[PDB]
Amino acid sequence: QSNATIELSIVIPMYNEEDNLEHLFARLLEVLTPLKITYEIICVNDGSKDKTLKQLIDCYQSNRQIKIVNLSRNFGKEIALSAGIDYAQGNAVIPIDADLQDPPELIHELVDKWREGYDIVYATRRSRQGETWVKQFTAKMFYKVIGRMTEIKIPPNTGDFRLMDRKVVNAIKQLPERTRFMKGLFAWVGYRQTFVLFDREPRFQGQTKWNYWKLWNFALDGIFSFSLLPLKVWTYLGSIISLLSLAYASFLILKTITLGVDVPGYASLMVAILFLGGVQLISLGVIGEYLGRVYEEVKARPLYLVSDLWGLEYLP
Amino acid sequence: QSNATIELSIVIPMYNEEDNLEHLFARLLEVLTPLKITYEIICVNDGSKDKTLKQLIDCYQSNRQIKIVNLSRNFGKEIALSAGIDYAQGNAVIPIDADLQDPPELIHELVDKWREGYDIVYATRRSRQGETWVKQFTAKMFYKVIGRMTEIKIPPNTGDFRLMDRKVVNAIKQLPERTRFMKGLFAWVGYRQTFVLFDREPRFQGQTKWNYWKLWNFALDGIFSFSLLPLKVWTYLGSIISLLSLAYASFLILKTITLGVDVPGYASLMVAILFLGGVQLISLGVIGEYLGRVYEEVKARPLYLVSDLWGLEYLP
Amino acid sequence: QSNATIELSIVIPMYNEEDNLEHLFARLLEVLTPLKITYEIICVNDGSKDKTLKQLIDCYQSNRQIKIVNLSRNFGKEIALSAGIDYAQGNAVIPIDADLQDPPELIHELVDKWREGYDIVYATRRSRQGETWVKQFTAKMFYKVIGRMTEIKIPPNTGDFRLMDRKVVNAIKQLPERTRFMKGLFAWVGYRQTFVLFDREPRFQGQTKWNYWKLWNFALDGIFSFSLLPLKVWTYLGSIISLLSLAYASFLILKTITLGVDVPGYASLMVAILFLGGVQLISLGVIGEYLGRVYEEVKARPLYLVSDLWGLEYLP
Amino acid sequence: QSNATIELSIVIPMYNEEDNLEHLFARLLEVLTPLKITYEIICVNDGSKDKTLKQLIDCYQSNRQIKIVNLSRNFGKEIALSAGIDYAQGNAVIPIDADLQDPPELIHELVDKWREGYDIVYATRRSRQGETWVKQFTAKMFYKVIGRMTEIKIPPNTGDFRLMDRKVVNAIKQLPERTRFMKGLFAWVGYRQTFVLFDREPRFQGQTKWNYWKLWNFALDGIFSFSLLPLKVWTYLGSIISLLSLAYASFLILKTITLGVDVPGYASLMVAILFLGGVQLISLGVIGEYLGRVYEEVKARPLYLVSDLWGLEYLP
Ligand SMILES: O=c1ccn([C@@H]2O[C@H](COP(=O)(O)OP(=O)(O)O[C@H]3O[C@H](CO)[C@@H](O)[C@H](O)[C@H]3O)[C@@H](O)[C@H]2O)c(=O)[nH]1
Ligand SMILES: O=c1ccn([C@@H]2O[C@H](COP(=O)(O)OP(=O)(O)O[C@H]3O[C@H](CO)[C@@H](O)[C@H](O)[C@H]3O)[C@@H](O)[C@H]2O)c(=O)[nH]1
Ligand SMILES: O=c1ccn([C@@H]2O[C@H](COP(=O)(O)OP(=O)(O)O[C@H]3O[C@H](CO)[C@@H](O)[C@H](O)[C@H]3O)[C@@H](O)[C@H]2O)c(=O)[nH]1
Ligand SMILES: O=c1ccn([C@@H]2O[C@H](COP(=O)(O)OP(=O)(O)O[C@H]3O[C@H](CO)[C@@H](O)[C@H](O)[C@H]3O)[C@@H](O)[C@H]2O)c(=O)[nH]1
Numbered sequence A, B, C, D: 001q002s003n004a005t006i007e008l009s010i011v012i013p014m015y016n017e018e019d020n021l022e023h024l025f026a027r028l029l030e031v032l033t034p035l036k037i038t039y040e041i042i043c044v045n046d047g048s049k050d051k052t053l054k055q056l057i058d059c060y061q062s063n064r065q066i067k068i069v070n071l072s073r074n075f076g077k078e079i080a081l082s083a084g085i086d087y088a089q090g091n092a093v094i095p096i097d098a099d100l101q102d103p104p105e106l107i108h109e110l111v112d113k114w115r116e117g118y119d120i121v122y123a124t125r126r127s128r129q130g131e132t133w134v135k136q137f138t139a140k141m142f143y144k145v146i147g148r149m150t151e152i153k154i155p156p157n158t159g160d161f162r163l164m165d166r167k168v169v170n171a172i173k174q175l176p177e178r179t180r181f182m183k184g185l186f187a188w189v190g191y192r193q194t195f196v197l198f199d200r201e202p203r204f205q206g207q208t209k210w211n212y213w214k215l216w217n218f219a220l221d222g223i224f225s226f227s228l229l230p231l232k233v234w235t236y237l238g239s240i241i242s243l244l245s246l247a248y249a250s251f252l253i254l255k256t257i258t259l260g261v262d263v264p265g266y267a268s269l270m271v272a273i274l275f276l277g278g279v280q281l282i283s284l285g286v287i288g289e290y291l292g293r294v295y296e297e298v299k300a301r302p303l304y305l306v307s308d309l310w311g312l313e314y315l316p
């Protein structure tokens, strides 16, 4: 009997991952055989510049569970993951890395948490460990900032290693977004979510020169995709500055009448500067409010997500 | 004979509404039985953190008229109402609250007004009563402001308790909008609209610490979704300021030629400040006009709504 | 034999047009009978506040050529025309006014020009005549301005009285736009276009107190929907102002070194003011360029329009 | 046996190309007959103002390989090319010019490079030659700038003469964009790309008065469609200016306390000017970041492009 129903999809983005395919596939097979479930392995070639696709085709010829999504260009790991998840058909989908920095054995644990009713199972590191103090402090500050500014609650130490139920995968597919912060998006599609702790081996504990410009832009993407306060604060700042300018002008007139001293030219210049700056900041704040509305409209997120229905059929 | 056609949908958003389901359903059944019409009760669980969904499933098992829309997350009362209306199939749809602050008996009156040809029947409180003076004054000022700025006429004292005909429900479904002001949207879909007065009981007359930041943001949403004047005023303000700067410069030159006194440096600085501020305000106004056009485009409201046709079929 | 193919659609937007329906329909029938072609009359009730819809239904009961599009609200004459054209099915579509200020007899002439191969036949007044000098001068200046700024060539003295071939009607339907300047849109869908001159009778020559705020907003819509120069000029203005500030600073330093006089504080303030204003104007210009790109994207106009094909089928 | 499968499409945009059709078609037939492949010639009349369409119809009557796309208006060469490619159905598509400035014989070479597995084959001039020094320097500077700012790598000396595989054509059709920089778009859809060198004949080496305003706007389109840095730089500039203002104020206070001299009015004015300018530049930078996100959303580019699949079917 052929099930024809994939229970588990393993999505691996690959970029120059030759001389890693054999070990990765051996470990994955060793982990996935005891699970006794139908599975597929979607390997997404993200424009590799070496003999990765050739070895992938060699493995695909012999192993029926291997499928290849060959992207035209190198789009990056996140976009390769998105493509692999788009082409995945399992009831659960697990993104994993080809270098096996995240132990594939934990897949089993994830599957267990998936069978207890959880729709998202994050694989979270117990501690950051090998990451430098600067990286840890910046990550902690970013998470605190995004928690304060936004209404989403991104769990700590969560990477791309996770299990997503088919329902969560379809919810993520319902989000047409070109500027995606995946951590915030997974927090936003709030289903039954849990986490499984795992200690990453010292082989991959810390070895990375982080490009802090890329990290800064990633944090900016996360903040801007889920908060509009940076656009709203300016109208109130302009109102405060204009009020200060008006109060200063009133005080200058009061000193002119009660002391008989004409207002100095620099004081009038300061009043005009503050008033014009506040008016322009109010205009910028109104523009920012309307631009936030436009951004919300063009992100085109669903108003809601239905997780379960009783007595009703799902709307197309 | 099975009608298979729901005449009335009752949409109830629920968030932690356990220990209220029994009384709510008993009152609703007592009201809806004499109506002698087929009905459904769409209960929308908006991510309740207690045993609300369990009791909802218990009620759904026994009562065939109860259906449950279980949202993945807590999206808020308005979004839960939107989801329930999306899943409703009655000829008329009535959003009601689970705490029964709005008397369900008035449903009957609403249905009567629905059978007289009205497409929207608002349930309006006779007086605000228990609301504090600050709340009443802010609401009155907001309604006056939105009436002056916009072309819509939002009726006073209207809440979410209302009856919408299927035609109005479909018109609202035709509005893809992520930043929705529902009061203004219902005013904008102008069908045959009336209201039914009702005095809310002292049990729910006034007990609420209003978060005026949330109210302010709600008013901002309402003003910005139906008015573009806050974007347009800035170009005229900049034109006025630039004209004043040019007139001041002309007066300074006139005093330089007729009195033989060279222009003081502070006067020239003031002229430059005013001219640059006016030019930047004109630029901000042009940007605001184009941003208002962009906002109108991305709101993607239908150009018109057809209420009735004679000799023609409805366009798909 | 029943043709079942409407050759001509007459679209009439109506708002409080009772006591005009009898004369309008009599004149239209007198004009359209000699044409010996199948026709329909789409009357669009734009939320009339009198017994217009009742008389329209009375006429529709007896006359098989009358169809009624009843809009939910009063959306305005232009939107009512858009709805009527959307519901029209004739090979040619002619928008006409219910008061018959434009002679329906000219319809015949329009039809003639339609049979000579022209896709758009404008009905143009020979002279403005009754319009005041202010109105004529403002219209002439607006048309000159829109001709200079844009690449479209809006013909003079063209109103809503025109004939549009089905191909032009479908091209206009291909333009999803919520901020529409119909004159510019018809110029933009450039098919075989001609005009027929007609002298409007003194009964409707001039009687109108034009709301120049509405006319100004209409002109702004026309300019902004087909020109982006108001967004682009600001970056060049800022560049010029910044260059002037830098040159002034250089001249001040040159006078400081060649004359031994330290730069006065007001001169340094002026340099800073001009430099900051120019930098902010460059920023506003870059924002305006990107906003113009966004506006072009969200207007979603077709890249091209195909008028004829040889050896190919039309793309869906 | 009728193949019914076009192997090669030749897309020719034509604008006033009468007295060139005979030579163009003779040369094209001479080149395309030895290829021994099925082909079509899509001639796109871009609103020609002479007897171009008549001769095109005459040629289409006799030659079964000629098809005509008659655009309603003159939309420009690039849009005419887009329409012709949209109506092309060959496995490979080659845009060529009607004046035959690019030798059609090179088509053969392109086809050869297409059969070696390349999806895009650019026809690149060996040297610019006849172009003036100003044109060459501006082109080189523009290409260096777009290479530095963006992540795309536009090949040098590439024109519209190229071969695109059906897969690349479909990828380009997947890009709904009204503001298109085709060079950057072809760089962005990164498939197997190569180039074929060709020396353009002295008949077309250099004869052109380039409109540098149009070239400047084209370069602006290219930079803005693939870079957001012009929107991002302003927040950092504002931060720097605000920091300088704060440092200047601190230095002034330090001199006030350590020297006992009250701060001059011009110094305080300068501090206020710099602080307000920096705050407004930060606001403009935040607006620019959000506007860049909006532009990315409304460009609606696909997240990825799949070039090949193994074990999976293409997603609809
Ligand atoms: O453009 C691409 C496309 C796919 N992949 C795949 O992504 C998987 C793992 O990516 P990897 O580069 O090994 O990242 P990590 O090991 O998880 O750690 C990263 O941590 C930083 C951000 O997490 C990155 O900037 C660093 O490159 C890297 O050390 C592998 O299968 C790769 O093939 C890439 O890395 N880059
Ligand atoms: O996130 C949610 C989702 C659903 N519901 C449902 O909405 C119904 C009624 O909502 P409720 O909180 O009782 O509001 P009201 O009784 O109508 O009065 C409100 O008046 C203010 C705005 O109307 C609110 O901010 C206050 O929370 C509240 O006092 C109930 O079925 C709730 O279960 C919520 O209230 N919050
Ligand atoms: O909201 C609506 C909906 C439909 N119509 C119909 O439009 C037709 C003609 O409109 P009308 O008001 O008579 O305009 P005109 O006679 O063409 O002249 C106008 O010229 C100005 C702009 O053209 C308008 O602002 C003035 O109201 C009016 O004098 C009639 O069938 C009306 O019923 C309106 O006028 N207003
Ligand atoms: O609006 C249109 C529509 C179609 N075509 C067709 O495009 C082909 C070639 O265009 P052409 O005008 O001859 O450009 P080039 O010979 O490639 O060189 C150009 O180089 C510059 C930009 O490449 C242009 O601005 C100059 O007009 C021109 O010298 C011909 O089949 C034309 O019919 C146009 O040129 N303009």
Ligand SMILES: [Mg+2]
Pocket: A097, A099, A101, A204
């Ligand atoms: Mg790794």
Ligand SMILES: [Mg+2]
Pocket: B097, B099, B101, B204
């Ligand atoms: Mg309540």
Ligand SMILES: [Mg+2]
Pocket: C097, C099, C101, C204
């Ligand atoms: Mg009239």
Ligand SMILES: [Mg+2]
Pocket: D097, D099, D101, D204
């Ligand atoms: Mg040429």
